[PDB]
Design a protein around this ligand. Sequence first.
Ligand SMILES: Nc1ncnc2c1ncn2[C@@H]1O[C@H](COP(=O)(O)OP(=O)(O)O)[C@@H](O)[C@H]1O
Ligand SMILES: Nc1ncnc2c1ncn2[C@@H]1O[C@H](COP(=O)(O)OP(=O)(O)O)[C@@H](O)[C@H]1O
Ligand SMILES: Nc1ncnc2c1ncn2[C@@H]1O[C@H](COP(=O)(O)OP(=O)(O)O)[C@@H](O)[C@H]1O
Ligand SMILES: [Mg+2]
Ligand SMILES: [Mg+2]
Ligand SMILES: [Mg+2]
Lengths: 526, 526, 526
Amino acid sequence: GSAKDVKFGADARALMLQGVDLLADAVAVTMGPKGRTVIIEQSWGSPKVTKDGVTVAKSIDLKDKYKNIGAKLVQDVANNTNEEAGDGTTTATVLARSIAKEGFEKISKGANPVEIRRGVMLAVDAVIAELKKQSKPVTTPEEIAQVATISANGDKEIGNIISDAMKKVGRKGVITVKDGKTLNDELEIIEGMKFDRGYISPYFINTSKGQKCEFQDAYVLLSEKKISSIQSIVPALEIANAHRKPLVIIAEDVDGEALSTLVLNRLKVGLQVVAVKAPGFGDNRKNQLKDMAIATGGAVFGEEGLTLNLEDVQPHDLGKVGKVIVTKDDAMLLKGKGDKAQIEKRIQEIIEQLDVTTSEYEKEKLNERLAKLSDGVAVLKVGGTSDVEVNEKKDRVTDALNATRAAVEEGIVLGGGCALLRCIPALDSLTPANEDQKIGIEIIKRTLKIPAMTIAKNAGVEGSLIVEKIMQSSSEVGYDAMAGDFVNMVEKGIIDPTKVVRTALLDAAGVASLLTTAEVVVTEIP
Amino acid sequence: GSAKDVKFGADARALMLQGVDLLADAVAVTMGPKGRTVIIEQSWGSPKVTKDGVTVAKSIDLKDKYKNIGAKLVQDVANNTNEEAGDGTTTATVLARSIAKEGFEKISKGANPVEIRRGVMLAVDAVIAELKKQSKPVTTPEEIAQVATISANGDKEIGNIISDAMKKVGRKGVITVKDGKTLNDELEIIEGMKFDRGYISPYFINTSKGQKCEFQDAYVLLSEKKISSIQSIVPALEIANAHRKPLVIIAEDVDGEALSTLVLNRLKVGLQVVAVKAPGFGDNRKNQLKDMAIATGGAVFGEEGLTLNLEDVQPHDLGKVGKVIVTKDDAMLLKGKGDKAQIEKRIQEIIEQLDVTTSEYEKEKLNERLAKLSDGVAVLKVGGTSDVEVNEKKDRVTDALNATRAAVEEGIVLGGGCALLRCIPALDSLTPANEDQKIGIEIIKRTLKIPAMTIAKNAGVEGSLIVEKIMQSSSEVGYDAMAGDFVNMVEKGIIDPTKVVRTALLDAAGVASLLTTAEVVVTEIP
Amino acid sequence: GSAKDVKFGADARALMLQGVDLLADAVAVTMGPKGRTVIIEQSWGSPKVTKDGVTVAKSIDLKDKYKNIGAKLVQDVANNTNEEAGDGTTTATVLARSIAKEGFEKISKGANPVEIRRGVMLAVDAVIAELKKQSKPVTTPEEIAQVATISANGDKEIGNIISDAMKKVGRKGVITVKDGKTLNDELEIIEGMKFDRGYISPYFINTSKGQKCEFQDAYVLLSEKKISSIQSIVPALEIANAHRKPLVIIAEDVDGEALSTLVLNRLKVGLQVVAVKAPGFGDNRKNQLKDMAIATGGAVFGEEGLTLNLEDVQPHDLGKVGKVIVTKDDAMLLKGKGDKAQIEKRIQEIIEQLDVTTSEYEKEKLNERLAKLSDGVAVLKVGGTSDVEVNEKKDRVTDALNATRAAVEEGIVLGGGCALLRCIPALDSLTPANEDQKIGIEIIKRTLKIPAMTIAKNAGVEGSLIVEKIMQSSSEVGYDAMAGDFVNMVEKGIIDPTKVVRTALLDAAGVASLLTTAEVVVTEIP
Ligand SMILES: Nc1ncnc2c1ncn2[C@@H]1O[C@H](COP(=O)(O)OP(=O)(O)O)[C@@H](O)[C@H]1O
Ligand SMILES: Nc1ncnc2c1ncn2[C@@H]1O[C@H](COP(=O)(O)OP(=O)(O)O)[C@@H](O)[C@H]1O
Ligand SMILES: Nc1ncnc2c1ncn2[C@@H]1O[C@H](COP(=O)(O)OP(=O)(O)O)[C@@H](O)[C@H]1O
Ligand SMILES: [Mg+2]
Ligand SMILES: [Mg+2]
Ligand SMILES: [Mg+2]
C-alpha cells in the first residue's frame, strides 16, 4: 500500500548489490560451450529448462524488496539486450554486475557517481568505436554457419540448416521457427502466397492426382464481400472465358446461385474456375485481400470504404498469376504480377507497423510472411523427444537466427570475449576530465575482461590466467574453451556478431552506471 | 512477478534427485509378472488401483518444490512414453532414474554435462540401431497372443480375446475397450455403420420380434437440414416406390407434415421406410453425414455451399445399402456401396486430421470407427465384480492392445529386458570423442542393465546376479521371473514389441540427460 | 549418547564449505600492507581490534553446526600455523580455503579423495623442497629489520627496535613484549638475575647515592628455610670475612637474632653483607632459589631431601657472582659463576617443562628470563594512547618477533607471495601415479597463486592480472602492493621467513586435504 520504508547509502547499496549478485550468479552458469542449464518451475506445467540468460533473469524475483530492486534492474538490462539483438544476454548480465560492483565499491564521500557514470559512458562510446573498427563484414556463407553454430552452443546441424535456409531464402529473407512432431529438425521452404483455405467444392478438382485444382497463367478475382447468387459474378466469367485463362476467386464466401453457376460451367463445358474462402478473420481478412490484391496486381471488390462493384469489372481490375495450386485445406498462388515498387512499399508499411505495435496479435507477421513469399520463406520445424527439449533447442535456434541476422546486417568480430579485450588499449589512450571519469574508465577497463574469464571459469579452468595469456598473445588468437586450448579465433570459427557485443555492453553499462548513482532507496513495506 | 527462491549445484541436484528417486521407487514395484499394484486416492470417489507406471507417475506431485521438479520431469517421461507407445512406461521411468542418478553422480568441476548429454544420445542412437537389427517382424498370430498376454501381466484369456478380435477385424482394424456389466470379458463385433439414434416413430417397426425396423437392399437419403417440409419429401418417396426398395432417411429431424406422410403411407399402404435423426450434434453432424454419404455412395442434401435441394433427386443422388437394422436407441447400416477409393481416401483424411490435437478430439475417433471397415469394428467389454477391478483390468487390456499394435507395426524383440542387454556390445564398439561423451556412453551402458534387474528384484531374487548370468548366457536365453528360472525367451513367449523398448529408452534418456545438465534451480516460495 | 543428525555428500560438503568460506572471507581482509582490521566483541570489556588472522579465526564459531565444523577446521589450521611459526596465519587460512574449495569441486563418483590427498601431499613435499632451494640464510642485520618491518605491517620503528634488541641480546636470546605506560615504544635491557625483592634493612646501604647496596666479587648464600638464627649464619659470616669478600644472603626470611648480628657487624667494623627475602612464593620460590643456586654456583640450604644444613658450610657451597646491586624494591645479581653445561641443561629443562604444561601460570617464563639473563633479556614496552591500540600493536610486534626468529633459524625467501609462485615449475616436473593424484597436484598448483592475488586484491587492484604479470616477469621481481608497482623484491625489502611459508602451506594443505575426503557428516541436534 501507501506505507513505505527507506534506506540510506552503502547499506542499501549492499542489499541491492546482493540482489544483483544473486541474479547474475544464477545467469552466469549458462555462459559459453561448457556452460550449463537452468531449470525454472512453471506454475501450471512441467518446468522449463534453458541456457538463455534473459529467460533465467526474468524468472527471478526476490522477497527482499531491495535485492528485488537490483534484480529488476539486471533483468531490465538482459531484456533490453534480448529485444535489441536477440543474443548476448548472459554477457550483458555479467557485464552489468561487473559495472555495478566495481561502481559501488569506488563510491566515497568526495566521489560524484553521476560524473563517474559520465566517464563510464565516455569509455563505452570509445570502446564501441574501436569495435566497429575491428568489425569485418560477413562474406562467405561458411561464416554464417559459424556464427549460427556458435550462437547455438556448438550444434553444427543447427548452423548448417540455418545456412542452407538462408541461402535458399536470402540473407534478409524470412526465416521462422516452430515445433516439429518429428524427432529431427526439418527445413521447409514455401514459395508463393500460401494460406489455409481450400476449394469450397470438390467439383473444382482438375488433376485427380493429389486431388488438387492446378492452374497456370491464371487471373484472380478478389471480393471483400460474399458473392451470393447476384450474378455480379457472371461478367467476371464472361471476361474469363474471353481471354481463355483459368480463374481463381477469393471471397468472404461464395455460395447461393453463384456457386451453382460455377460448378455447372465447370462440370458441363470444362470451364477452368476455382473458388476459395477469404483467409478470413474479421478485420484481418481485409488487410490480407488487400495484400493479395497488391501482389497479384489488381483490386478488391466491395469495401466500406469506397466501392468497386462486381458487376463492372475490367481485365485490369482482376489479378494475374504465374501458377496456382489449391487443395481441400490450403491455397497457394505463385508468380503473381504487380508493381514491385508498390509491394516493397507494402512490406515497408507492415514492417514499420509491426515494429511499433506493442501487441502480440502476431498475425501482422502472418501477413508479412505472405507478401514476402515471392522471395520465399523458411519454416524451421525443430524436433526432439519431449516438449522441454523442444523449447530448449528452439530457444537456441532463435538465438542463432537473430545472431546471424545481426552478423549480416552489422558485422562479425572475434568470439570468446576477445573482441572486448582488444578494445582496452583504446581506453588506454583516453583523456579523462577528472578523477571521477577516470574511475569510470577504470571500471569499464576491468569490466571488459569479464566475459572471457567467465567462459573460461565455466570450463573449469583458471579464467584470469587465460585472460592475461590472451592479452599477452596476438590479436588474432584467443582461447577455445570447448577444445580447452588457444587457437586462431576466426580460423577456428569462434566469432560473435558485432551488433550483439555492442548492444550487450551499451545496455548493461547504461543501466548499471545509473544504478551506481543511488544514495537512497525507497520501498513498500510487507 | 511472483517472489522466488533459487538453489545452486549438487545440493539442488540432490533434492531433485530425491524427487526422482521417490517417484521412480513408487513406480518400479509394478514392474514384471511378480510386480505389485499401487492404490491412489481419488478426490471424489473410491480409490484407484493400478499397475500402470504412467498413472502412478501422474498421481504423485510433491510439497518440496525441487523434488516436485524432479517428479514432474519423470512423469513427463512416463507420459511421453505412454502417448508415443502405450506400454513401456515403468521401464521408461526406471531407465530415466538410472540415467539421472548415474548422470548426476559423474558431474564435477571440469565436466561438461551438455557434452555428456551428447555422448548419451550417441549411445542411444547406437543402441536403437542394434535393436532394429534384432527386431524380427511378427508372423504367426500366436505371437500376437504372446505379446498381448505378457503385456497384460500373464492373463492368457486377455491375449486370446485380443488375438480373436484382431483376427476378426484385421491387424490394423479398430479395436476399442469398455466396461462390461457382465462378470466376464466379452468380445462383440460390429459390422457396418452404427450410431446411437433411433426411429422417430414406433409405427416404422416391421419385425415385432425385438421391435426393430429391418430392411435389406435399401436406399438411404441424407439431409443436413430438418425435413418438416410439405412435400419436399415426396419425390424422394415416389422414386423409392418406383424401384420397389426400402428407404431409410437420416436427417437433422423429420417432424412436420413429412412425418405424417411417412407413417400414413407406412400404416395404410405398407411402404418400407424408416426415418431417424442425424447422429448429432452441431458441426459434427455435417462430418458424420458426409461420412455416411461417401460410404453408402451418394450425396447430402441441404446447405454446404453447393446446395442440392430435396425436391430434385435422382437415383444416383441417394445411397445404397446391403442391409439396415434400426431400433428405439440405435441405427446400424450394413454393406453400403460406394467407391472404396474415396472411402479409404476419407479414412486417410481423418487419420491425418486426428493427427493434432486430441484434447479433446474424441469424436474424431467416433467418426473413424464408423467410417472404418463397414465390415469391421471390435468392442472389448471387460468384466469383473467391482469398478476398481474393472478399471485396473481395462488399464492392462489397453496396454496389451497398444503393445500388439506396436508389435505388428514395428516388430518384436526379446522380453525380460534382455533386448536392451544384448545392445551392450554395440556400445562396446563405439568411438567416443572425449571424456565427457565416454561418461555418457558408460551411463547408458549401466542403465541398460536396469529393467531386467528390476523385474528380477520384484521377484524376490538377486536381480544383478540374474543380469550377469544372462549376459554370460547365449543370446536366445533369458530369465523367466514368473517361473523363476532361465529359459529360451522367444520359445517360452516372453517378448516385447520393439517400438516400446525403443520409445521408453529414447524418451527417458532424452529428458534425463537434459536434467543432468542443470546447475541452478529456480522455484516459487510457499 | 546424545541424539544426533547426519548428512550425506555434496550437500554437507557445500555446508561445511559455506562455513570455511565465511571464516576465510573474514580473515582474508587483513592480508598485506593494504589489508584491514577486524573488530571482535569481547564479553566483558571493550572490543578487540586485530590484523591477526588466527585471532580472527579463533573468534568465529557458527550456529549452523556443519558450517561450524568447517570453521573449526579452518581455525585449527590457523592455530597450528600460529603455534608452529607465529606468523603466516591469514596465509594459512586462504590456502586452506583454496585447497578445500578446489578439492570439493573436483570430487565425483569415480574420484578417490584419499588418493587425491596423497597427490596433494606429494605436491606439498615437492614445493617445500624447492622452497628450501630458494632459501638464502640471513646475514646482514638490515635483513632482520626488513623481515621485522614487513611482518609488522610496514612499521619501520618496530623492526628497528627489534633489530636493536636482537643485536644487544642476541639472535637466539630472550626478547619479551609487554604494555608500556609511555605513549611511545621503549626497549629496556636487563642483565643479570633480577627479581623483585629488596634489602630487609636500610642499614645495609653503602653508596648513599641512589640508596643502593652495591657489591662486586661477592659470595651468595641460599637458604630455602627462614633464618631466625640458631646462629647457623655465623660460620657463613666467618667464612666471608675470612676470604674478605662481600656476602649477599637470600632466604625465605632473615629474622630475629640473625638480622641483629647482620646489622651490628654491618654498622660496626664495617662488614660487607646484605640480606634479602626469597623471590617467592611457596613452591615457586624453591625452584627459583635452586635456579639461582645453579647459576651462581654453590648449593641451596634447608630441606629438599638430602638436607644441607647452614651450620656446616664450605666455600664451595655458597656461590660466586661478578657484581650485585640491591635497593628497597628489587635485587639484581650479575656475572654469577657456575657450570654453563648445567645452566643450559637447566634452561633446556624449563622449556621442555613449560612446553608440555598448560595452565596460564606464566611464572615458568619468569624463570626462563631469570636464568637466561646472563646473556641478557629485552623487554619491549609498547606504547599507544589506548589499551586496544596497545593490544593490536603488541600483536604485530609479537608477530614480527616470531618472524625474525624464524628467519634467523631457517632462512628468508621472497615476499609478496612470490616465493610460492616460483615453486610452480617444480610441480610442472612431477610424475603423478594416477588421475586422482594429478587432480591433487593441480589443486596445489592453483592454490599457490592465492596469497599474492589476495594481497593485491586487498590493495584494490586486479590481483590475478598481477599474479600473471609476476609469473611472466623474472624470478627476482614481484609486486610491491603498498607502493602499487613492480620492484626487485629482496632489494626493496619485501621478504618472508621460509619457515612460515613452509608451515602455513604444510598445515593448511594438511587439514584441508583431509577435509576434502569427507562423505558423511554427523552433528548434534540443537
Ligand atoms: N568453443 C568456444 N570457445 C570459446 N568461446 C566460445 C565458444 N563457444 C562460444 N563461445 C563464446 O561464448 C559466448 C556465448 O555466450 P552464450 O552462452 O550464448 O550467452 P549469450 O546468450 O550471452 O550469448 C560468445 O561470446 C562466444 O564468443
Ligand atoms: N514371465 C516373465 N519373465 C520375464 N520377464 C517378463 C515376464 N513377464 C513380463 N516380463 C517383462 O516385464 C516387462 C513388462 O513391464 P510392465 O510391468 O508391463 O511395465 P510397463 O508399463 O513398462 O510395460 C516386459 O518388458 C516383459 O519383457
Ligand atoms: N609492500 C608489500 N608488497 C608485497 N607484499 C607484501 C608487502 N608487505 C607485506 N607483504 C606480504 O604480506 C604477507 C603478510 O601478510 P599479513 O597481513 O602479515 O598476514 P599473515 O598474518 O598471514 O602474515 C607476507 O607474505 C608479505 O610478503
Ligand atoms: Mg547465445
Ligand atoms: Mg506393460
Ligand atoms: Mg604477519
